[PDB]
Design a protein around this nucleic acid. Structure first.
Ligand SMILES: [Ca+2]
Ligand SMILES: [Ca+2]
Ligand SMILES: [Ca+2]
Length: 272
DNA sequence: AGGTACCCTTTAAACCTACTAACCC
DNA sequence: GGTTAGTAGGTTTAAAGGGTACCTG
């Protein structure tokens, strides 16, 4: 387990949070995903050797670091292998807060305000706790290895196969392999950077999310990539089945209609 | 006051199709 | 002509993102 894959992953799916209740303040960071990939959590768990997994919620598993003193291992990991997403801003923010706690400054009705001003500029914002602290606040704060991208893709990627309805092809259809990786429109910073990292691939706008889409000859490049740094999780069946199509469709086998049958079969049994 | 854990709710991620364009020429 | 590609439209869940209560101090 490479130490960048972790950041690459946490950049894509981690969740640094500040909660407030009745005022009790506690910091959490958790990765939440489909139960089928509990083992990936377990891989990560054992890697940091801290935190815990449980069933939040249905057909899912959450993993969480909620002890103060275990969060330090995390924070220590993330400074040396910093993060590239706007999530960064959430860490810096999450981290400052952990400072305040490190000193016990948050037992003061004052520290308590220094923390909400942070919380207010976190993932979503102040909710019911807008009128409690209507004194406002705030001020939120280049790919790194390629193990980052393996991590980033293995969580925020999609390896799918395309059966177009070309009325022109003798089969009446086109097999094509696209690779996708979606992210918020606010991360234009990162998406544009994904393109330059490979010097190829399409950037597209949709529903306020952007997609980095990636020509066979390029499709093959990144195929080579995930030999050098592969995907991890259940999601690497989809890669392999995709990868498989990349062979049985790369010796002119995707043009015979005995083969398209074969492809759909493969495709049919992937993603779902 | 710090754990530790049973829950929850929407939405940004993943996943789909089907037509145009610009390609081997 | 036949194959590619770049595009427009989609659907749906697995995330992206939250809570508060319970022991033990
Ligand atoms: Ca994400
Ligand atoms: Ca994922
Ligand atoms: Ca470039």
């Amino acid at each position: 387990i490479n130490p960048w894959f972790l950041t690459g992953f946490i950049d894509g799916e981690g969740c640094f949070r500040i909660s407030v209740t009745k005022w009790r303040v506690q910091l959490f960071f958790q990765i939440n995903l489909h139960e089928k990939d509990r083992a990936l959590l377990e891989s990560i768990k054992d890697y940091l050797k801290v935190g815990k997994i449980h069933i939040s919620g249905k057909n899912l598993v959450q993993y969480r670091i909620q002890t103060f003193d275990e969060l330090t291992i995390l924070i220590k990991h993330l400074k040396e292998y910093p993060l590239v997403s706007k999530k960064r801003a959430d860490f810096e923010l999450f981290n400052t807060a952990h400072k305040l706690i490190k000193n016990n400054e948050h037992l003061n009705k004052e520290g308590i305000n220094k923390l909400v001003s942070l919380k207010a500029s976190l993932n979503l914002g102040l909710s019911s706790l807008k009128l409690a602290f209507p004194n406002v606040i705030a001020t939120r704060l280049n790919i790194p290895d390629p193990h980052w991208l393996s991590g980033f893709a293995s969580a925020e990627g999609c390896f799918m196969v395309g059966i177009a309805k070309s009325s022109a092809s003798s089969t009446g259809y086109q097999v094509y392999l696209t690779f996708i990786l979606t992210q918020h429109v606010r991360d234009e910073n990162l998406m544009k950077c994904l393109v330059d990292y490979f010097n190829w691939g399409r950037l597209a706008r949709k529903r306020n999310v952007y997609e980095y889409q990636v020509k066979f000859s390029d499709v093959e490049k990144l195929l080579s990539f995930f030999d050098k740094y592969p995907i991890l999780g259940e999601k690497a069946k989809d890669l392999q089945d995709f990868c498989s199509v990349s062979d049985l469709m790369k010796s002119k086998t995707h043009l015979t209609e005995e083969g398209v049958a074969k492809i759909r079969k493969i495709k049919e049994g992937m993603n779902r």
